[PDB]
Design an enzyme around this catalytic site. Structure first.
Site, PDB file in Angstrom:
ATOM      1  N   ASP A 182       0.804  -1.238   0.000  1.00 31.80           N
ATOM      2  CA  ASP A 182       0.000   0.000   0.000  1.00 31.80           C
ATOM      3  C   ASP A 182       0.838   1.291   0.000  1.00 31.80           C
ATOM      4  OD1 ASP A 182      -2.228  -1.645   0.034  1.00 31.80           O
ATOM      5  OD2 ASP A 182      -2.910  -1.068   2.034  1.00 31.80           O
ATOM      6  N   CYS A 216      -0.488   3.235 -12.361  1.00 33.67           N
ATOM      7  CA  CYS A 216      -0.778   2.697 -11.066  1.00 33.67           C
ATOM      8  C   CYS A 216      -2.171   3.255 -10.706  1.00 33.67           C
ATOM      9  CB  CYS A 216       0.352   3.046 -10.070  1.00 33.67           C
ATOM     10  SG  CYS A 216       0.876   4.810 -10.039  1.00 33.67           S
ATOM     11  N   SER A 217      -2.247   4.154  -9.732  1.00 33.96           N
ATOM     12  CA  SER A 217      -3.517   4.785  -9.381  1.00 33.96           C
ATOM     13  C   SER A 217      -3.481   6.267  -9.788  1.00 33.96           C
ATOM     14  CB  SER A 217      -3.792   4.609  -7.882  1.00 33.96           C
ATOM     15  OG  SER A 217      -5.132   4.913  -7.554  1.00 33.96           O
ATOM     16  N   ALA A 218      -2.491   6.987  -9.288  1.00 35.42           N
ATOM     17  CA  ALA A 218      -2.362   8.395  -9.620  1.00 35.42           C
ATOM     18  C   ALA A 218      -1.483   8.546 -10.857  1.00 35.42           C
ATOM     19  CB  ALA A 218      -1.774   9.148  -8.446  1.00 35.42           C
ATOM     20  N   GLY A 219      -0.708   7.498 -11.152  1.00 34.43           N
ATOM     21  CA  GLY A 219       0.130   7.443 -12.333  1.00 34.43           C
ATOM     22  C   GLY A 219       1.392   8.270 -12.258  1.00 34.43           C
ATOM     23  N   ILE A 220       1.946   8.393 -11.053  1.00 31.52           N
ATOM     24  CA  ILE A 220       3.202   9.100 -10.806  1.00 31.52           C
ATOM     25  C   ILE A 220       4.164   8.363  -9.870  1.00 31.52           C
ATOM     26  CG2 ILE A 220       2.271  11.383 -11.283  1.00 31.52           C
ATOM     27  CD1 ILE A 220       2.015  11.893  -8.273  1.00 31.52           C
ATOM     28  N   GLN A 260       7.248   9.590  -6.345  1.00 32.43           N
ATOM     29  CA  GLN A 260       6.495  10.476  -5.489  1.00 32.43           C
ATOM     30  C   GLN A 260       7.163  10.673  -4.126  1.00 32.43           C
ATOM     31  OE1 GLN A 260       3.998  13.255  -4.156  1.00 32.43           O
ATOM     32  NE2 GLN A 260       4.664  12.684  -6.238  1.00 32.43           N
TER      33      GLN A 260
END
Ligand code: CL
Length: 283
Positions: A182, A216-220, A260
């Site tokens: 996570d 991914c989710s936020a793509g960063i 990130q």
């Protein structure tokens, strides 16, 4: 411009030097876009995270027909330059939402992407990404996706897809890497290297085709990790050195916030290190 080129020895030492990597990471600006820079009313509706936005100069512009509005061209996705500044080596994008799945596939189709790399479970406490591909067949706007085969690997599963519009067919390899924690980076970079190497073989097999789509989710975060590692291993292979600082800065020139956290930054170094041990002695 922000530069810190590391030889293979230097690279191997900095792994046991987390302290320095934290402050090195902290010296790189995120390059997040000012909301006012994007002039596409209601682009927010198509964003999973409201402050993770595509830099407009590098955003992937959907090419639908017979619409007049800018929102119709919008997807939270940026082209990412590869090794040597190779244009459109990747697309970094967010996990598709329910209302952006057709948009996603419009992008994969229109860009002629050979590979999708998905680095996220659908749910990791929160919803991170929607199930955007079919078991057998699905129709997503003007694009038909067909599952030709599924391949199971140790650390990911592959769907071998074809996309169809009319007479035209395009093969897409969809990789699903689900074991990333996570909020922690993985304890081993081997799984991600394995993925990077399989995808690297797909790119060599896909000459002239479009960008590898990574999300991914936020793509960063994870997406930035995967792409930074891919390019940095490519610099390791060609030059015998790696400038991970520079790489991450250029990535953030392409899409704000790429890689990130400092833990991610370190993890990229673990991967680049792991890659380096497999290279033939230096010369
Ligand atoms: Cl369907």
């Amino acid at each position: 411009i922000p530069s810190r080129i590391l030889t293979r020895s230097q690279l191997r030492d900095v792994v046991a030097s987390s302290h320095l990597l934290q402050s090195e990471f902290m010296e790189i600006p995120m390059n997040f876009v000012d909301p006012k820079e994007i002039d596409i009313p209601r682009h927010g509706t198509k964003n999973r995270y409201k402050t993770i936005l595509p830099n407009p100069l590098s955003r992937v512009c959907l090419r639908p027909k017979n619409v007049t509005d800018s929102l119709s061209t919008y997807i939270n996705a940026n082209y990412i330059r590869g090794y040597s500044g190779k244009e459109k080596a990747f697309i970094a994008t967010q996990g598709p939402m329910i209302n952006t799945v057709d948009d996603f596939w419009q992008m994969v189709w229109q860009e002629d992407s050979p590979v999708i790399v998905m680095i996220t479970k659908l749910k990791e406490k929160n919803e991170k990404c929607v199930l955007y591909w079919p078991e057998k067949r699905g129709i997503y706007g003007k694009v038909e996706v067909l599952v030709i085969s599924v391949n199971e690997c140790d650390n990911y599963t592959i769907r071998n897809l074809v996309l169809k519009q009319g007479s035209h067919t395009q093969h897409v390899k969809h990789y699903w890497y689900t074991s990333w924690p996570d909020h922690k980076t993985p304890d081993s970079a081997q799984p991600l290297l394995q993925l990077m190497l399989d995808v690297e073989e797909d790119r060599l097999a896909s000459q002239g085709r479009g960008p590898v789509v990574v999300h991914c989710s936020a793509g960063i975060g994870r997406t930035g990790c995967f792409i930074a590692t891919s390019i940095g291993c490519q610099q390791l292979k060609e030059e015998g050195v790696v400038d991970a600082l520079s790489i991450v800065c250029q990535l953030r020139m392409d899409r704000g916030g790429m890689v990130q956290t400092s833990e991610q930054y370190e993890f990229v170094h673990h991967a680049l290190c792991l890659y380096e041990s497999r290279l033939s002695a230096e010369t």
